[PDB]
Amino acid sequence: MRLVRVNIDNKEIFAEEGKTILEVAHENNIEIPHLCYDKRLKPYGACGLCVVEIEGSPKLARACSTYVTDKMVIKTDSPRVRNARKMALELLLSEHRGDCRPPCVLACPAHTDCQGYVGLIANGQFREAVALIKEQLPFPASIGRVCPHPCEEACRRNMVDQPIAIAELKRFVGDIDLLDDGYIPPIKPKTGKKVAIVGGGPAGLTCAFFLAKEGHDIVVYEAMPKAGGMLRYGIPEYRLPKGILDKEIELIEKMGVQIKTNMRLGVDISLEYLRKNYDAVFLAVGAWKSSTLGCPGDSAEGVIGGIEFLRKVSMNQPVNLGQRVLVVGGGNTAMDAARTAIRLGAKEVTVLYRRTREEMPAEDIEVNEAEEEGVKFQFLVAPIEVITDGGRVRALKCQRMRLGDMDESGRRRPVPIEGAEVIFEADTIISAIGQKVRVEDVEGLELTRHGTIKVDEGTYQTSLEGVFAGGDAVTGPKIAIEAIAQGKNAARVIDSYLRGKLEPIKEPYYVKQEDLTPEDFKDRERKPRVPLKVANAEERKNNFREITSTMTEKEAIAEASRCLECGCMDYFECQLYKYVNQYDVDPQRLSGYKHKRYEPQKHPFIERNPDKCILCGLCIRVCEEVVGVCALGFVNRGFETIVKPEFGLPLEETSCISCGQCADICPTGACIGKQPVAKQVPVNTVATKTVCTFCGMGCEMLVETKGNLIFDVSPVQSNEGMLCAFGRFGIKYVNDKDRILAPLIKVNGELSKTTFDQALIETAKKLQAIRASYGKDSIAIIASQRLTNEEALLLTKLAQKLDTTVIGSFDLRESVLDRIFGLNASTNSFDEIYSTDLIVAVGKVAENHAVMGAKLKKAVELGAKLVTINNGETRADERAIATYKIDNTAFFKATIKALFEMKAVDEDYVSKIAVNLDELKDDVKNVEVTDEASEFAKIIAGAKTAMVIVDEESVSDTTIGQLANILTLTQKIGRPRCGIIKVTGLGNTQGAWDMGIRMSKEGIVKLINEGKVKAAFIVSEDPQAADKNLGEVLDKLECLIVADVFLTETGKRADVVLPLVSHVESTGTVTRADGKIQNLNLVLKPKNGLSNLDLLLKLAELFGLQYNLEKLNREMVELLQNENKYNQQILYTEGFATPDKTVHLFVSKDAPAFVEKAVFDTVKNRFEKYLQDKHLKY
Amino acid sequence: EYRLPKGILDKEIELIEKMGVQIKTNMRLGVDISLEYLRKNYDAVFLAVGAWKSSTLGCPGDSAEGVIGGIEFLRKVSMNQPVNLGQRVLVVGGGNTAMDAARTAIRLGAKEVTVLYR
Amino acid sequence: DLSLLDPVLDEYKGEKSNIIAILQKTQEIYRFLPLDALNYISEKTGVKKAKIYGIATFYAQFRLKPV
Ligand SMILES: Cc1cc2nc3c(=O)[nH]c(=O)nc-3n(C[C@H](O)[C@H](O)[C@H](O)COP(=O)(O)OP(=O)(O)OC[C@H]3O[C@@H](n4cnc5c(N)ncnc54)[C@H](O)[C@@H]3O)c2cc1C
Ligand code: SF4
């Protein structure tokens, strides 16, 4: 080898020869875009995103294909490269039909993940929904109570029946969160920076919330006695109760924000003080100066500003109303003042607006409600004079006006009508025509002509350096969520400025669908919206009690289940979106004809969408090169190309095995794997690495969860990075709602729920009664093979405590390997498949285990020779040099005789290492050698190294023994790259056998039939469902105790049913088929709070066994060491494990080579039944 | 357990331990601890050992296998230790021990249990 | 019918690199490539079905609709 010297982005690198530029840049922390590149597949070159400029070459070179040479200067971000990538991304977007974020998210000024928390509500994850809200909205309940909800105006469900009640759902989850201890987001470590926020309103509190999250020291100066702003001294109590506001502000203060109330800028505190002792200052003073009437006599007593009147009312200060009140204005202030006056005892309240009803800035619902309460309205009327008699207002003279022409807004301009004047009798006049920023609070700042503070757009920075502003002080009076969005943006900008580099807010570019029409939703089911509970007008017009009430949990879930899921499910993991955000792409210039070919499918696991396919070919290349099924392919040619299954059939009708590799390799959400949850929702999940337990290959995986629900499973890029149907999709049983979480005991002949202590006591007493009455060896323990090593060891210990040697499993087959070699284990490891010379795959190795099929495909591609022995067709027969279809073990006897005849057996060494050779020769002396047996013997003899892969769950023990004999005769045992590997049927078969569970189904059934066994303790097995003939056998047991995840058909006939938890809720140790020890991590906490090991430890402590996880692990390690099996990659290197230390050659009579058996494990049987019902393969 | 559940007893003993009493279990007088040790390092010693030796039958053959003391049998049952019961059980006595043993044997699967009182 | 393809499949057997010729002969015989005929070819020659559909739809000379 040679070390090549390259230069990538002005950084000298010493890379290795034969590497692509992509690999070198990846290993040297240089980012190169790529969409059609995978490490396990040959280069394709379609997308053209990885183009880099190489000095000395005129054309841009693909980094996924070009190999680094010596003295190579590579520029991966030159303007030529940037333009090429931008053009490629624009071309890809021109044919893209998707929705990066739903219209509900885009319509919200704070850009709250509306679809996210709506879908989380529909799944029952209320705390996760609240946490998602608090990522952009610190006040879920308060804002949900008071918000015009523009998101519902943009909701796509408007095209079907009625927009989703997003505000109501947010209020519901906010109420749930506030009912218990509130949710505080994680706080970054203290940065030692102090920020001074002036104002305790939504903008200031939002800035404090999003700056304390960054670890800064936050102090909020508030002039009013209590924080809240116009959410407290504006909005009345019947619309927003102040207890909720107090609770939210207390939650904010719990984050470390110091709110100094009664501190006023310019009166108690000067701006110089803040600028001197604080790094940054954010002003959120708001518009706190109501506009004067603007007509003569506006200063007469009896005329009061709207916001001042509402502040006096909220503060419970004495106000001077009367029988007759008129409110001048049309905003929220006018309507709130009118309704407050109605509730404060005014007999007549009349609202005067200069425009008409249609141009009323107030919401229609508020106006209608006030009309129900008794507020009268006069439109097209504006004030011109205040008739005051003795210094107190007597009436007000208005000039009627009419809509003449257009205005600055462009809709319509009202102009006065000459000769039209009306006198309205007035005891109180509330001028609520709008509010302006108080000039005193904003001294020393440059003011916009409108009176608001002038700030630089995108940075929220005032004229003074280090002083920021936002909210109503900058934009004028708006809705509260706009102020919250301003506060959040200003907080992000202030954090950037504090870090040193000030960066203006950059709005991302989203792919959105604007061609949608209601005709696209003509097939969706119409569901009624959630009813709104509104208090009676007569009863509510007298008190300040809240009008609307929060929805119930059932109504909230039913409402959130109405969502159409408009946003892309791959938003958080789409790379096309990331790349189009990284480059200034202008898609409109190239937009044109776009295909619409998505048709819904019935596949329960994988959903394909042709409209988001960038035609990278990754799914086809991974189904053909790695999996080897070749169920996908290109269809048509040119602009009409589409990825389709075999003959365009549904994925279930093809040979697809539902591995999900196509969904895992797709970059742009065209192919996705459906989440195992009630409602699909695109969420940012957390991934934990664990081990699949559905067969002995022990594939590692990353389980991605959000809350207590599992949302996805991804393969680990260890080797071929592959998962089969089980590991990828059968993790759905963790979220299953049919799981039992509390024990059941038999009361009055029926199973009913109880406590764990009582159930375990009953179990112990029943077992003790059986042992006492019927003596020793009368209790059978039928444990599943998916339990950890510690649980199996504990079950063996408990069986010793019960004086019973019947410790076995219904999934266990009769052993042959321990009578030949000494140990029932695989001699070699999965790492020697690649380096062996010949592979003998016996049974349905590829069909049962798809990952092993991919491993064999890779090994044969690397140079190995494959010989498949089976009875029917196999996917491995394509690349097999020799294929044998057999049904009897006479084939192996004939092979042994052929080996002996050609003198391919070194009799001296074999007789030295293997006793029982004369009998084997005598046994094979009479069989007839066939052509197939002779060919197989020639192949075996001519191979330097040989590995025999045996599917233990579909191969009889006679075949295994005969193959062991063949390996021993040709001296292919105990050496590197030679041996026998058993692919066990379940996750921890090897560990269960090593711990002491070594009784097969037949022995236990026989013992029950003779009447020797009178009770059974079944741990997560389903004898009744899997086998009908066992139903009578279970009738012979006096007592049956079942420990299962689900209430199976065999748990319904038990006396005690104990609940188990999934394998993602239990930490421990499992053993791979080759003997490798792997760790089961804790992805989720146990749903009932008790793990399987905890339950079994409680039961054992009831018998006087003092154990824990560490002690059991130590005992397991000692047990493995005593058999010379611990951390040994190759077995029998020194000598065999038989007492003679020799091979006891397998001599027996002929028998069927392969067997078909059921699965007794509960979860695996359930998932296999599910796949059979859905007509899927695996 | 059907007359006094052990959870209640555990809760009461935990309440007692909450007062500052240190209960050293598995410590036996004369085997693990000598009386001199207690008399030397403690001001006062209070012995509450109780009557923990069941009376033998007092008839020839009382040592034959299949004859077990009442309190020892009940202790084995409570500790969930394996006892060698059978279809036929006779309890000799008339106290609380005899009745508890008879009812435990009935609940432990004995077909018929007969109590012999003089 | 499917027996009409029996001679062609017998002529181009032993190698899975002659699928385009088989498709052309099927196109000449049936005047189109029915999905049942493509299934029969896929079963007889041993080439994967997706490959057959791709090679068939690649060219404009092969049309999968009855005359
Ligand atoms: C009557 C009324 C009804 C409304 N109804 C709704 C509704 O139904 N829905 C909706 O979405 N929005 C509504 N709004 C709008 C919403 O209340 C405001 O737009 C929002 O609160 C703006 O908050 P802010 O932080 O910009 O300023 P504000 O909340 O107006 O004030 C912020 C804080 O600044 C403080 N402050 C002022 N001067 C100083 C100073 N010199 N020193 C220190 N602190 C100072 C004040 O004490 C106040 O606490 C309503 C507003 C009003 C007036
Ligand atoms: S596939 Fe990616 S780019 Fe396309 S809509 Fe979905 S998230 Fe956006």
Ligand code: SF4
């Ligand atoms: S804050 Fe208002 S606009 Fe935003 S999602 Fe909630 S109701 Fe809609």
Ligand code: SF4
């Ligand atoms: S249907 Fe759901 S995702 Fe679509 S706009 Fe409405 S709330 Fe958002």
Ligand code: SF4
């Ligand atoms: S899920 Fe089916 S189509 Fe996708 S890669 Fe696996 S076998 Fe191929």
Ligand code: SF4
């Ligand atoms: S569907 Fe297949 S070809 Fe299309 S983007 Fe996904 S992986 Fe690439």
Ligand code: SF4
């Ligand atoms: S091959 Fe076995 S270990 Fe791997 S994913 Fe499938 S069931 Fe799980």
Ligand code: FES
């Ligand atoms: S061309 Fe190299 S990743 Fe696409």
